[PDB]
């Protein structure tokens, strides 16, 4: 068992396998990947600022510490100061946690984690460290500032979120959901994207709140060559509230980023790569999302590159309101062999879309030749590494230019490690099938999730004039039978309208498409299973889905009635949909484990998957798309938040089950990533041990040129914003 809000000493650590991918790269491609990786790792540091008030200080402190003394050197100091090996290991694991999450909160669960050792003992180590002897003011200053928050588990600090009972740095501490809604309405009214923005509320002597919308850029208030953004840099009045649009957020960090983007542009393989980089540079320098969208368009047109990459404020999972983006950047190498199955999935893609439970009027008008590749990651900077990505997120680009589907092969391999001892909530005979088919069924689900999942669906949009992108005269809502009553307007996006459930809603729809189309005998041939093998993959994919729905309860907060992770919430919903169908399709039974502790069992009648499960899923999937397409947020919330409701109602009694899920939960593994170094001419790949110490070393060697400078930059930016929290 393991306590909430701490990382266990025996937490799994896996090293990313990137040697063979890197070895295939030409000298030019290596220099390209080198600078892009540097750009990504630089930008990843901003996530610390986007996580918690104390995160940038903690990184700065750990960085100083391990720069003067590596894990084996520090051990000799720490053990001489009274720490046991167990206590030192807890600190190593904590440091690795902060590094891998770019913050002292889990990227997967948004929960705080603290060092599993006495604070006073850790103080002796830090204050007596070699880093402390060399820079006593800096180290004591850092410890004084972030020491308490490093350990504090006060209830309001335990989870990320808006309001008084949660921590967020996307907003000032005094901001609530009301403030976010107001800010979003303002942003939409000015056609300004929330992706690269943060919101700060300050009051005067009269208590009247003033709002600051701050954009992320190198440039500040000073005049620049750009006019599209600088013209927005002014004061506004919106529904009685003062609004000021500023920029300069993470400026010296983004300055490092564009330096490496510029250097990468010297090694671009084609004009599409050169142009997309110049636009990203414009985006990060000026604070223009329009510039980033232009870059994304050029990126989509760069088909099948050897070195694939993307960077910026992309995903909006961590923003409590759900519109602001967290910085991420990745560099990956194309895997020709593993891209085969996904490219033939493209061949039958347009056909399979017609098998989806909604009319073609609710589907994209012009079908675009989709891009689906399997890649090997060299760098994935930010709060975490996904198994697959579907990008860009700009919906207008999605329905005019296209989008890229990416499966991260060497990331998937890390997830393909599950001992049958850890396979909880399954009877014996189901475990065997699970081990055999979890791998292939994932490729199926991920494939459909990406291409036909996120890639399907049309948004009904009315422009500035009364013209629609759909035939409002003949298009009929299949659920109501009436003509289309609601749609998206100018300035409105998926995130802007559905806000807090936008991410989870869409992941649920995507997962449903995958689960739904996994019953198709033809899709089980593109991946090539064909027989009972194909049938087995079906059952396992459905058994894994309903098991994950139970496991999802770890990421629900009863006191706040709040889901903390979009994908897990999505999988719980699907469990609820299948449970709603009744007729003995899926049952959850509270049992007792061999260790005498509370347990549970998930039973799935495989015979009733097609007769009961599919019709229930088909109906659910249809309702999801209709409400999404029509932008029916009220209906969308009523449906989704209804299934996402967690109660101790019989017979399932989920609240009771949750306590069992927490009891037997398994901590997600930490992933160590390699480094690339320049030997003047040649680029070398540096690899590290699959351990906490190894992960620490990988970051210790990650910024050889300007490590101490980044420490000071993060400290400076944090201190400037200290009043907000």
């Amino acid at each position: 068992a393991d306590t909430q809000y701490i990382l266990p000493n025996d937490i799994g650590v896996s090293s990313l396998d990137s040697r063979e991918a890197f070895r295939l790269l030409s000298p030019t491609e290596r220099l390209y990947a080198y600078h892009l990786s540097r750009a990504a790792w630089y930008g990843g540091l901003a996530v610390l600022l986007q996580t918690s008030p104390e995160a940038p200080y903690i990184y700065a402190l750990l960085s100083r510490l391990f720069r003067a003394q590596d894990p084996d050197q520090l051990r000799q100091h720490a053990l001489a100061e009274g720490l046991t090996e167990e206590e030192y290991q807890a600190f190593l694991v904590y440091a690795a946690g902060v590094y891998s999450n770019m913050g002292n909160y889990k990227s997967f669960g948004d929960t705080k984690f603290v060092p599993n050792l006495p604070k006073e003992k850790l103080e002796r180590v830090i204050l007596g460290s070699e880093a402390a002897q060399q820079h006593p003011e800096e180290v004591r200053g850092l410890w004084q500032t972030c020491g308490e928050l490093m350990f504090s588990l006060e209830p309001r600090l335990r989870h990320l979120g808006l309001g008084k009972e949660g921590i967020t740095t996307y907003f000032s501490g005094n901001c609530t959901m009301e403030d976010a809604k107001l800010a979003q309405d303002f942003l939409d009214s000015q056609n300004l994207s929330a992706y690269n923005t943060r919101l700060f509320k300050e009051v005067d002597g009269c208590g009247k709140p003033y709002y600051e919308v701050r954009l992320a850029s190198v440039l500040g208030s000073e005049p620049s060559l750009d006019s599209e953004v600088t013209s927005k840099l002014k004061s506004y009045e919106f529904r009685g509230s003062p609004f000021q649009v500023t920029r300069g957020d993470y400026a010296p960090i983004l300055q490092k980023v564009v330096e490496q983007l510029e250097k990468a542009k010297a090694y671009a393989a084609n004009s599409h790569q050169g142009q997309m980089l110049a636009q990203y540079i414009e985006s990060f320098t000026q604070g223009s999302i329009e510039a980033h969208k232009r870059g994304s368009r050029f990126w989509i047109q760069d088909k099948g590159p050897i070195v694939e990459s993307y960077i910026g404020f992309i995903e909006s999972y961590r923003d409590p309101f759900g519109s602001r983006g967290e910085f991420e950047g990745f560099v990956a190498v194309v895997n020709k062999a593993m891209s085969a199955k996904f490219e033939r999935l493209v061949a039958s893609a347009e056909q399979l879309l017609k098998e989806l439970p909604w009319p073609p009027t609710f589907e994209k008008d012009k079908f675009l030749t989709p891009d689906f590749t399997s890649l090997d990651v060299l760098t994935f900077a930010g709060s975490g590494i996904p198994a697959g990505i579907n990008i860009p997120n700009y919906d207008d680009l999605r329905q005019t230019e296209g989008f890229k589907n990416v499966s991260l092969g060497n990331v998937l391999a890390v997830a393909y490690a599950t001992q049958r001892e850890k396979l909880t909530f399954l009877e014996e005979d189901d475990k065997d099938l699970y081990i055999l088919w979890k791998g292939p069924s994932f490729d199926v689900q991920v494939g459909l999730h990406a291409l036909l999942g996120h890639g399907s669906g049309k948004l009904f949009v009315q422009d500035e004039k009364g013209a629609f992108n759909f035939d409002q005269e003949t298009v009929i809502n299949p659920e109501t039978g009436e003509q289309i009553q609601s749609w998206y307007r100018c300035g409105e996006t998926w995130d802007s309208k559905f806000s807090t459930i936008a991410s989870s809603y869409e992941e649920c729809r995507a997962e449903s498409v995958g689960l739904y189309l996994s019953l198709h005998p033809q899709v089980l041939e593109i991946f090539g299973f064909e027989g009972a093998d194909a049938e087995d993959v079906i059952y396992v994919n459905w058994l894994n889905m309903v098991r994950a729905g139970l496991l999802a309860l770890e990421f629900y907060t009863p006191e706040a009635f709040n889901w903390r992770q979009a994908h897990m919430q999505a999988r719980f919903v699907i469990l609820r949909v299948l449970l709603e169908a009744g007729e003995g399709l899926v049952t959850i039974t509270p049992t007792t484990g061999s260790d005498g502790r509370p347990d549970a069992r998930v039973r799935l009648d495989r015979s009733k998957i097609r007769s009961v499960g599919k019709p229930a899923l088909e109906r659910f999937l249809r309702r999801l798309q209709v409400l999404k397409s029509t932008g029916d947020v009220a209906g969308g919330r009523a449906l989704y938040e209804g299934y996402a409701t967690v109660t101790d109602a019989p017979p399932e009694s989920f609240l009771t089950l949750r306590d069992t899920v927490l009891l037997r939960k398994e901590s997600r593994k930490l992933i160590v990533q390699p480094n690339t170094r320049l030997e003047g001419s040649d680029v070398q790949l540096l690899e590290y041990e699959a351990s906490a110490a190894g992960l620490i070393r990988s970051f210790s060697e990650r910024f050889p040129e300007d490590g101490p400078e980044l420490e000071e930059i993060l400290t400076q930016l944090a201190t400037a914003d200290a009043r907000f929290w």
Binding site: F108, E315, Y317, G384, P386, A387, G388, I389, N390, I391, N393, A415, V446, H449, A450, H454, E506, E507, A510, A548, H567
Partner: peptide, 5 residues
């Protein structure tokens, strides 16, 4: 859109 697990 990212895909975890």
């Amino acid at each position: 859109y990212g895909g975890f697990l």
